């Protein structure tokens, strides 16, 4: 039995940060009381087409009923160069530009 997607709004609490593994971490809060629900998170090449690239690493991206105002960290493996972190789906999704150095 799986959970439906989260339908409420996410916000970034701090600026995304690069890790030793070359991945990026993103700390978000969630305004909804529609939990338990599944956190949508992906990397995109551009903001208009939202073509998926890279991969989400966090294995349990789920908001629970007890989550409330606590903060969640998501970890993604972005492509080399420019891409966008996209948290959530639909009208209220949030994006942040990311650049991964190297080749």
């Amino acid at each position, epitope marked *: 039995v*799986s959970y*439906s*997607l989260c*339908t*409420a*709004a996410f916000t970034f609490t701090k600026i995304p940060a690069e890790t030793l593994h070359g991945t990026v971490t993103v700390e978000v809060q969630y*305004a*909804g*009381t*529609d939990g338990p629900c*599944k956190v949508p998170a992906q990397m995109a090449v551009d903001m208009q087409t*939202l073509t998926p690239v890279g991969r989400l690493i966090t294995a349990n991206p789920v908001i629970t009923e007890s989550t409330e105002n606590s903060k969640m960290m998501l970890e993604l493996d972005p492509p080399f160069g420019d891409s966008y972190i996209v948290i959530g*789906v*639909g*009208e*209220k999704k949030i994006t942040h530009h990311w650049h991964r150095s190297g080749s």
Partner: antibody
Amino acid sequence: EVQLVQSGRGLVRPGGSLRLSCAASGFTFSNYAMSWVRQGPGMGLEWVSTITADSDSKYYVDSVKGRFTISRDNSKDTLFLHMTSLRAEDTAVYYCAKDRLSRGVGELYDSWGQGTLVTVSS
Amino acid sequence: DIVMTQSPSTLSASVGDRVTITCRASQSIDVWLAWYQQKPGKAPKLLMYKTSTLQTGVPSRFSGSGSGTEFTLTISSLQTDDFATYYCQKYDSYPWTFGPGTKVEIKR
């Protein structure tokens, strides 16, 4: 142009069942969440149910949980609502509605069907 | 649940008049509020979303404002095509609750 053609008028006795259908054309049906919205004397204009583009997520207003089931067939571009245990207060015009942006959860509706009158009376 | 109300339920106005109608939420929905217009016997049409962004093809006499718990839809100069019922709808989160509607009638 976007077209949402819903099934014909339905009359049900209390406790009965009914399935509504909505045939879509004029847009990429498999990329949009789809919703059912009803308008009747018992509840006014009221959202009923939403199903994501890939049928992975389904949502229901509390008064229909356990009685109504939403589904879709993307190979025929068709949306379904399976209504069971219908009560008199469910009497309404039922609308097919398309999400404005693709890959969403039914937040906003930019195209609607013509509507299906559903009367529930003994 | 968040309760959506609207005021007034009905008002009469004349062509050229400035018309404002109100939508309220029992608790804050931030900016995620949309407006629809509906004629008798037809389905609603999306007018406006994110409080103040006009849907494509909607004439510029429509405008919205407000934040949190109080929202308004304004028609700067009413035209005959604008006599209809108007609904607000929240989308901070599901359920996607519509307001009860405001009917704009002709004044004489």
